[PDB]
Nucleic acid binder design. Structure first.
Ligand SMILES: [Mg+2]
Lengths: 172, 70, 29
RNA sequence: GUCUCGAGCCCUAGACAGCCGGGAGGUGAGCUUAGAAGCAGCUACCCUCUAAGAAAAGCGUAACAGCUUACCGGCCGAGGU
């Protein structure tokens, strides 16, 4: 099979070996696309994902490579934005971005601050009760967003009564 | 402004309550000219253009109650 | 060729004298 | 999990899926009931408008409301089940 992806005018992408770098106005994303007998190349204005084999496993990955490249195109132009809201019942939760990590203080009454590190060139902007995770790499942004929700994970007590935490509101 | 269809059948029949099983148990009765009076009343309520199809909507409550037509 | 699609074309061709695919098919007639 | 072979059916008069739009009136059917208006129960389950739209398939409400299913139309475009 062979699937040709036309590159947008805002975007220009180079390639070396198995790595594909995609540059644009919102940033640059480099990804490694490696799978048996699947050749990913740049043919001037199009990105070609081809293979000599047409089996279920090869087809699965050709379609995964397509979505990864189309996502990189969107990332370097419009970008990726995940919106989050911080909910608290009794204890006022202090969410702040201290350095290259987002810190959550006084969660459920804890003295010790809960913290997670931000993945790559992802930016976390906070406007009071709303947080917006943004950046070019969907892998980095999607994780940094998820990491924030996962940071307030509660296994010991009932999640239905103890609903405090930062949750994902908008998915792109 | 115009009252419901279910009440307009009970006025020109003489009966108040319906039945336990419709069509199988006949209670009330209407004629040919008695359905032509109820067709003149409802105009913005019904979506029918002609006066012929306006009568069919009134009969669509009658035979499923216990009303026989003569 | 389904029988209802043929009967619908014959209903649209009738109203031109007196789906967007069934309208285009009727216009070509 | 993956490979191979057969059968039926659907499809460029646009299939399968997804997304958008519509999902309307007589009437909130009748009986029951303080009330029950698709949706507690019983019975019926009828016809207008129309390109569709059940006397309502599933949640939801004290009852409404609200969310969608049927069904119809659009976007899409190649196989689908
Ligand atoms: Mg316990």
């Amino acid at each position: 099979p062979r699937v040709e992806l036309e590159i947008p005018e805002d975007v220009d992408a180079e390639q070396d070996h198995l790595d594909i770098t995609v540059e644009g106005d919102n940033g640059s994303v480099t990804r490694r696309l490696w799978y048996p007998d699947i050749d990913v190349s740049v043919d001037g204005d199009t990105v070609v994902i081809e293979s000599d084999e047409d089996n279920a496993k090869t087809m699965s990955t050709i379609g995964t490579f397509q979505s990864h490249i189309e996502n990189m195109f969107h990332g370097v132009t419009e970008g990726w934005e995940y919106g989050m809201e911080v909910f608290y019942s009794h204890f006022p939760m202090q969410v702040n971005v201290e350095g290259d990590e987002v810190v959550i203080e006084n969660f459920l009454g804890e003295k010790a601050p809960r913290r997670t590190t931000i993945h790559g060139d992802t930016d976390v902007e906070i406007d009071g009760e709303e947080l917006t995770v943004s950046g070019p790499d969907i892998e980095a942004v999607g994780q940094t967003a998820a990491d924030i929700e996962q940071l307030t994970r509660i296994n010991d007590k009932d999640v239905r009564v103890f609903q405090d935490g930062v949750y994902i509101t908008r998915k792109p | 402004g115009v009252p419901p269809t279910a009440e307009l059948i009970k006025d020109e029949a003489g009966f108040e309550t319906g039945s336990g099983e419709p069509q199988e148990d006949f209670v009330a009765d209407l004629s040919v000219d008695q359905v032509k009076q109820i067709a003149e009343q409802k105009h913005p309520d019904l979506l029918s253009y002609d006066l012929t199809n306006a009568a069919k909507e009134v009969v669509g409550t009658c035979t499923s109650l216990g009303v026989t037509i003569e | 060729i389904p029988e209802w699609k043929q009967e619908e074309v014959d209903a649209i061709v009738e109203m031109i004298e007196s789906r967007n695919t069934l309208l285009e098919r009727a216009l070509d007639d």
